[PDB]
Write an enzyme that holds these catalytic residues in place. Structure first.
Site, PDB file in Angstrom:
ATOM      1  CB  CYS A  64      -1.673   0.502   7.344  1.00  0.00           C
ATOM      2  SG  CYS A  64      -3.263   0.700   6.504  1.00  0.00           S
TER       3      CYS A  64
ATOM      4  CG  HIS B 153      -6.181   1.699  -1.052  1.00  0.00           C
ATOM      5  ND1 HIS B 153      -4.995   2.339  -1.340  1.00  0.00           N
ATOM      6  CD2 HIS B 153      -5.844   0.580  -0.366  1.00  0.00           C
ATOM      7  CE1 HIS B 153      -3.985   1.635  -0.859  1.00  0.00           C
ATOM      8  NE2 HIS B 153      -4.473   0.562  -0.263  1.00  0.00           N
TER       9      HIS B 153
ATOM     10  N   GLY C  99       0.620  -4.034   3.937  1.00  0.00           N
ATOM     11  CA  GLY C  99       0.576  -5.470   4.139  1.00  0.00           C
ATOM     12  C   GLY C  99       1.891  -6.000   4.676  1.00  0.00           C
TER      13      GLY C  99
ATOM     14  CB  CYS D 130      -0.936  -0.006   1.208  1.00  0.00           C
ATOM     15  SG  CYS D 130      -1.788  -1.584   1.453  1.00  0.00           S
TER      16      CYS D 130
END
Ligand SMILES: Nc1ccc(S(=O)(=O)O)cc1C(=O)O
Ligand SMILES: Nc1ccc(S(=O)(=O)O)cc1C(=O)O
Ligand SMILES: Nc1ccc(S(=O)(=O)O)cc1C(=O)O
Ligand SMILES: Nc1ccc(S(=O)(=O)O)cc1C(=O)O
Ligand SMILES: Nc1ccc(S(=O)(=O)O)cc1C(=O)O
Ligand SMILES: Nc1ccc(S(=O)(=O)O)cc1C(=O)O
Ligand SMILES: Nc1ccc(S(=O)(=O)O)cc1C(=O)O
Ligand SMILES: Nc1ccc(S(=O)(=O)O)cc1C(=O)O
Ligand SMILES: Nc1ccc(S(=O)(=O)O)cc1C(=O)O
Lengths: 402, 726, 402
Positions: free
Chosen positions: A388, A358, A390, A91
């Site tokens: 944040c 997103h 993964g 991300c």
């Protein structure tokens, strides 16, 4: 100590996943269109001084394989000396590209760098690229792989965020996004997408539902489509977080980030390279940082990454005017707000991924540009952008208006 | 590379018929069963060498067996001795085994497996290397790959071939992950066997007949497995197939969910070898399977499970604890006293074995309900296909419910299962002892009260004996045989033989409070309740029980054991040493037991324990638990919670061995696994000591060191006894 | 700003493409094995000081998807704050990862970074990731795409390198790689690959043909596998280089880089990072540079990249003791040697990819570490490492022994 500056920061509208406007558009076309927009804003600019093009992309396969950054350099007719590199830090890829471009300028071995990301999730769905942490049993079994949405449900369970709590955040994100659009905050940075004939394909963030009500959000069923419905992941998560009895599944498609298509570009360069090309600096990259947390809960890496970038810049929360954290899930943002005591009116002030989407590899570059514009529209000084990641990572950047 | 691996007496007979069909008849002169040992490898090495040398005069091959079975098992004696430094030898051994099977598989001519009996483990692996599998549909024959039950994996190509035949998911779930055994009909249904014959005498003719017609109707495909053809498509797709890639990340999570996070290296290694092998060619996949096989063999868990489920279990079944010299005595009619959960289950497993059973209770209404337990079980078994109507009617007709003591006429085997009370058991036995045959076993199903005391209420005390079952009796595999002080060796061997006849496993225990199972499982339950009183989260305690490997978390088990009964056992264990001039130090759990009783939460039977109960189903931990015991105020490591429960039982087991309650570690290991649910990966509460591995190291010394580390932090009950020291 | 130092630089042996020893090894395992070796060499190193792991990977799909750098952090049990990012700049990805690590240290916002690359071409062949170009005929058609091997034949045609010239270079590469292996030059940097039982899998560069003869090289048929043997690419190349009448196809499997599996790791950090963890610096990153040339000839971008990095360090060709250029094709190295008048005794002195292989994502860090070892062995001072790139890019780096 070369300081790095943001000279331009633009993005496409975000096209929705199902019957989306951008589904017929190749992700390469999304990047080239933004390159063409930077050209219209600076036809004087000597593109030979652009030494690299750094694109984040989380699923770099098929339409997004083969170093899509280089394909953008070549397809748009940029100089062959302008490089082109793809990077994937999940991300954070869009923001990692910006930060890496800033660090390349500070090192003094690059002068003017394009940075951003592209993700066409309707054409290249998440997980298209494979991977060992999911598709290698020995590694999957050992690292206790859990999909991100269950980590979000687990965060809400541990912190005590109810279904109404996360839905209340979903509603405010829809409202603040609609107000930013109606107020014209996005008119200069969202570049409409057009076809090879000049015909309009999309000029707005399709995923938004500005008429969202708290009654409609309460009707939605918790996440049941995709990887989190295949079984076992709740038990895997509770084997590590052994003190909580049951996960409260609060997250739906209405309080989670939208799956969309989009791209974003940011022009980053030294002060010398800027004045050499007649560019007006919009903001300064004050500091960057990368930290992490447990990969099973997965979505708590922003908090140490935010503290780290604050310590690095000699600042605290009270020194920051605007906080921008990607709305992957409502509980992740509420956790972050609670942890750092973020004032409500400073946090994701123009709405976020729950309303607008997103697009993995591009989101970090989009919400950074969103803060560049909002600092300037408010005549405010500092903004902190974080996402944040993964696998339990986190990235954070502090920008200062100029 | 060779078909050999550096005396062994040849194991395979060679016969080439007139048409060129070579029959390889496996006949190990050293045993009743063909086993994948050093003699087999050398013999099949010669046979495969010769199949290649005489290829011009060979048209087909039939693999057969002169034994009652086809081929069953491997070289456990060698595998259990393989040290980490022997990993190369283990790797080379299965690599050589698979070169023989791979040559056999690719000779250019068809090979048929004449499966006359059980083909298990390496036996089925041999047949999977053939192109056609014919099985005689005889009684007792089984087919499957049960290597995982010994902590191993099918390292002779079973993983690679079943994945090529069925795909990753079906091969793992149906065949590999649990090592399930299948009778010939199911084996053909799922694809392990291609066709069936009614008698073993048709086998080799059917094999040669198939070779002949295969050569005539499929001359270009004869002797070519599906995965050796150009257009081979793996069922369910390869890991790169988008349909399989979508669900593949959930396979390890479902595995953790089923195994509850307990240490299970073999299923993890089977799944990895299955998926990793599907990504590459067959030969590369086979070598990857060898490396995971050698990884399991040299690990401690496989040695724990080989010790328990191969050596200990066979020592037990061979009569290790059965008194020497005693002969056989028939059982003609079993009389069960009490038609509750225990008596109804005893009546079922007895009648299912073929015994006539008289099920007596205080009322015919009660006894009939007891037989209803058997009829609910048979009804479920009929609709699911596990039995026929004729065999089910015969089973139920062997149970005669009654309320008249006169109906025990002709009973030569009494199994009493009424309430736990000394005087009630005295009177119940008194009013039947003169009705049953004069040679009748007088068995009592008790978990607490010493047998020597109960035996005084019968005239013929040398035939009184404890026969301890476990509920649900139809599913629990152990019978704990308790020898009273007057119990004869003959009565002991008669109950021993009964246990094997009803298909359960016996241990022989000397009379003592708590015997072996109840005493040891009490430490497991008491250790958890102590942790609860110390302020540990109930959810963490339950997670520690499942991740330790237990079949049921301890607070859930406590609700089912009833806290009132736990209190009685404690009140009766205090008198048992203070009325006998000794010291009794209360367990910390008793304070927790007594406060739950004080709150009306005595367990599941009352509708409220550590869990809430609604509609005969558990429904989450009682929320008042955290306020009552200050849950969260103590947060030790999960491994400390796991070890505290594992070490408490392992130490109590060693006590039982030191006091002569148990007479062998085989009884201790199997008795703990099958009796109370000690985790199989440990190999038993006694094997857990010799194989303990953690931070310090491996062995009895590491167990002592860790036990001392536990005693420093949690109490002196964890101090190791003298017998475990130097 | 902050000087960046190389503290460790190791690599696996390179397993060959067909019936290779590493084909059964997952590319993640290749990286974790190197992580474990760095632990064996520095057991007391506080891994919490490692802020990122940057891996180059050109085909990030399947076993190499899902951000393999993050998977290596989690699979090896490194601190969850150690990040993990995959990048792709075609052939220079391995050196780009080291360069990016060095620039992150120079920026001051990172202190200790693992950099390198991984490529298991026997399991994940080149092109497996598709590409934003080959799947886009409109882009392919406009950019005049031509495989790298035809640009190499075109370079030989233009410069006048005969089949005997390129085969002569292929011979010297087989000879010098054998001499380096015999002399034990690689003993401490090539880390043998072992399985989960410790059994040896591979301990040498099995692609090498140390008994290569000029007569044998002369018998090989020109490149006939992959994209190049399909139709049209010569006509496309000559449509741009219209003054060239015919392409002399001189490149074969014997004078081109080998398709191999391998990985490489480099530990990079500031002087304070090494002093704090008691690490001895081996070399210093003097300067890095990116540039390029035409993407149809594709493989002449090393010349301005080398000139730019010398220009960036105030150095000239005379100042460099060792030149390391990736042996993608023999004509590429000969062109580079002709252009810059590189002394033949300073160029690829320990052999190159023709002898040992070119595992795309890892090669850059492999040949970088090869020069750290040789500068130390010879007690020499400076080395320049560079690689050509697809799409006409180039990357160069100058290191100085410490
Ligand atoms: N350098 C700039 C580029 C773009 C824009 S915008 O088009 O108003 O977003 C503004 C500035 C500025 O100086 O504020
Ligand atoms: N339109 C605004 C201008 C300035 C500021 S502030 O003074 O930076 O708080 C806030 C706003 C707002 O819309 O909330
Ligand atoms: N109890 C066993 C489970 C599995 C196997 S094996 O899988 O054939 O190796 C053998 C036995 C045996 O005792 O012979
Ligand atoms: N239904 C009950 C079963 C058992 C017990 S107790 O175990 O004797 O506490 C009590 C009750 C009760 O309802 O009072
Ligand atoms: N063994 C322990 C018991 C109690 C606690 S406490 O409840 O957090 O104080 C902590 C530990 C520990 O090892 O950290
Ligand atoms: N008390 C025991 C009785 C029998 C055996 S056995 O003969 O090894 O089975 C072992 C022990 C022991 O304590 O280790
Ligand atoms: N995963 C780790 C690996 C190494 C180290 S350290 O090198 O002992 O600091 C620490 C950690 C940690 O998780 O804190
Ligand atoms: N810091 C070093 C690490 C590794 C090696 S090597 O193993 O000899 O390659 C040498 C040095 C050195 O100081 O020269
Ligand atoms: N063995 C040598 C040591 C030193 C040097 S030099 O000092 O770089 O000239 C060269 C060599 C060589 O092998 O050519």
């Amino acid at each position: 100590s070369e300081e790095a500056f943001i000279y331009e920061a633009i993005r496409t509208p975000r096209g929705k996943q199902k019957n989306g406007s951008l589904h017929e558009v190749k992700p390469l076309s999304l990047v080239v269109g933004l390159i063409d927009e930077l050209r219209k804003r600076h036809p004087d600019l000597d593109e030979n001084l652009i030494s690299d093009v750094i694109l984040g992309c989380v699923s770099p396969v098929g339409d997004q394989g083969g170093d899509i950054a280089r394909a953008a350099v070549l397809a748009s007719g940029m100089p062959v000396t302008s490089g082109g590199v793809q990077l994937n830090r999940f991300c954070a890829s869009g923001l990692e590209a910006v930060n890496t471009a800033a660090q390349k300028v500070r090192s003094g071995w690059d002068d003017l760098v394009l940075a951003g990301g592209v993700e066409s999730m309707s054409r290249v769905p998440m997980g298209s690229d494979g991977g060992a942490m999911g598709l290698d049993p020995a590694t999957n079994y050992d690292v206790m792989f859990v999909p991100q949405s269950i980590g979000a449900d687990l965060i809400a369970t541990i912190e005590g965020f109810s279904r109404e709590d996360v839905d209340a955040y979903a509603l405010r994100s829809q409202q603040k996004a609609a107000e930013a659009w109606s107020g014209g905050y996005f008119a200069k940075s969202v570049v409409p997408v057009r076809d090879q004939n000049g015909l309009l394909i999309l000029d707005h963030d399709e995923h938004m539902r500005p008429d969202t009500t708290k009654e409609g959000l309460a009707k939605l069923k918790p996440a049941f489509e995709g990887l989190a419905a295949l079984g076992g992941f709740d038990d895997v998560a509770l084997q590590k977080y052994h003190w909580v009895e049951k996960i409260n599944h609060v997250h739906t498609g209405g309080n989670s980030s939208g799956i969309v298509d989009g791209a974003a570009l940011v022009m980053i360069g030294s002060a010398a390279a800027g004045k050499l090309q007649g560019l007006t600096p919009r903001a300064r990259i004050v500091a960057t940082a990368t930290s992490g947390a447990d990969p099973v809960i997965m979505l708590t890496g922003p908090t140490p990454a935010t503290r780290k970038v604050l310590d690095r810049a000699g600042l605290t929360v009270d020194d920051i005017d605007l906080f921008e954290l990607n709305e992957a899930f409502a509980s992740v943002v509420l956790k972050f707000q609670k942890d750092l005591n973020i004032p409500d009116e400073k946090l994701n002030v123009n709405g976020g991924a729950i309303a607008m989407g997103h697009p993995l590899g591009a989101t970090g570059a989009m919400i950074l540009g969103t803060m560049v514009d909002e600092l300037e529209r408010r005549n405010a000084r500092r903004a902190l952008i974080t996402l944040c990641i993964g696998g339990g990572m986190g990235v954070a950047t502090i920008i200062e208006r100029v | 590379s060779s078909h050999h691996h550096h005396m062994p007496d040849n194991t395979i007979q060679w016969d080439k018929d007139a048409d060129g069909i070579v029959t390889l008849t496996m006949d190990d002169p050293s045993g009743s069963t063909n086993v994948m040992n050093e003699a087999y490898i050398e013999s099949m090495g010669k046979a495969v060498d010769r199949l290649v040398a005489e290829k011009d005069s060979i048209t087909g091959v039939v693999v057969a067996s002169a034994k009652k079975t086809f081929f069953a098992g491997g070289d456990v004696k060698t595998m259990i001795q393989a040290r980490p430094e022997d990993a190369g030898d283990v790797f080379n051994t299965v690599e050589t085994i698979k070169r023989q099977l791979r040559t056999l598989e690719t000779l250019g001519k068809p090979v048929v497996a004449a499966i006359n009996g059980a083909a298990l483990g390496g036996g089925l692996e041999i047949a999977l290397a053939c192109h056609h599998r014919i099985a005689a549909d005889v009684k007792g024959s089984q087919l499957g790959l049960p290597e995982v039950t010994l902590g191993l994996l099918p390292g002779g190509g079973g993983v690679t071939r079943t994945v090529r035949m069925f795909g990753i998911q079906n091969a793992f779930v149906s065949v590999l992950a649990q090592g399930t055994r299948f009778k010939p009909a199911k084996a053909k249904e799922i694809g392990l066997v291609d066709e069936l014959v009614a008698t073993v005498e048709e086998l080799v003719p059917a094999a040669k007949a198939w070779i002949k017609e295969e050569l005539k109707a499929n001359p270009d495909g004869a002797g070519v497995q599906p995965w050796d053809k150009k257009g081979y498509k793996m069922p369910g797709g390869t890991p790169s197939s988008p349909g399989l890639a979508a669900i593949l990340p959930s396979f390890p999570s479902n595995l953790r969910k089923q195994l509850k996070g307990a240490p299970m290296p073999a299923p993890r290694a089977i799944l990895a070898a299955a998926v990793e092998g599907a990504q590459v060619d067959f030969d590369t996949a086979s070598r990857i399977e060898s490396r995971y096989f050698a990884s399991l063999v040299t690990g401690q868990v496989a040695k724990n499970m080989m010790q328990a489920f191969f050596f200990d279990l066979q020592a037990i079944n061979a009569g290790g604890s059965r008194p020497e010299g005693i002969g056989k005595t028939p059982i003609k009619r079993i009389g069960v006293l009490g038609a509750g959960m225990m008596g109804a289950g005893i009546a079922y497993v007895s009648a299912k074995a073929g015994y006539e059973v008289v099920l007596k209770d205080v009322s015919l209404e009660a006894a009939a309900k007891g037989k209803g337990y058997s009829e609910k079980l048979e009804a479920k078994a009929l609709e699911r296909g596990r039995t026929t109507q004729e065999r089910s009617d015969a089973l139920l007709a062997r149970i005669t419910p009654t309320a008249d003591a006169a109906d025990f006429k002709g009973v030569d085997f009494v199994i009493e299962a009424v309430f736990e009370n000394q005087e009630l058991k005295h009177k119940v036995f008194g009013e039947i002892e003169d009705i049953v045959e004069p040679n009748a076993i007088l068995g009592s199903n008790t978990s607490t009260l010493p047998i020597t005391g109960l035996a005084t209420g019968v005239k013929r005390q040398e035939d009184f004996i404890g026969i301890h079952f476990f509920s649900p009796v139809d599913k629990m595999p152990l019978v704990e045989i308790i020898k009273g002080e007057k119990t004869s060796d003959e009565a002991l061997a008669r109950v021993f033989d009964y246990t094997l006849a009803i298909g359960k496993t016996p241990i022989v225990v000397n009379d003592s409070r708590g015997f072996f199972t109840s005493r040891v499982i009490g430490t497991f339950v008491n250790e958890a309740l102590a942790m609860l009183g110390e302020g540990v989260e109930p959810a963490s305690i339950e997670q520690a029980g499942s991740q330790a490997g237990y079949p049921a978390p301890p607070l859930q088990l406590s609700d089912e054991l009833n806290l009132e009964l736990m209190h009685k056992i404690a009140v009766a264990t205090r008198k048992g040493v203070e009325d006998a001039g000794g010291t009794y130090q209360p367990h910390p759990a008793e304070a927790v037991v007594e406060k739950m009783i004080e709150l009306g939460r005595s367990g599941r039977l009352k509708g409220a324990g550590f869990y809430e109960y609604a509609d005969g189903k558990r429904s989450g931990l009682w929320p008042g638990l955290r306020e009552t015991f200050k849950s969260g105020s103590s947060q030790p490591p999960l491994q400390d919670m796991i070890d505290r429960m594992l070490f408490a039982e392992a130490l109590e087991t060693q006590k039982c061995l030191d006091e002569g309650v148990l007479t062998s570690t085989a009884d201790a290991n199997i008795g703990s696994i099958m009796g109370i649910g000690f985790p199989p990966w440990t190999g038993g509460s006694a094997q857990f000591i010799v194989g303990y591995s953690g931070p310090a190291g491996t062995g009895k010394a590491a167990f002592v060191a860790r036990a001392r580390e536990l005693a420093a932090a949690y109490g002196d009950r964890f101090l190791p006894p003298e017998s475990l020291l130097s």
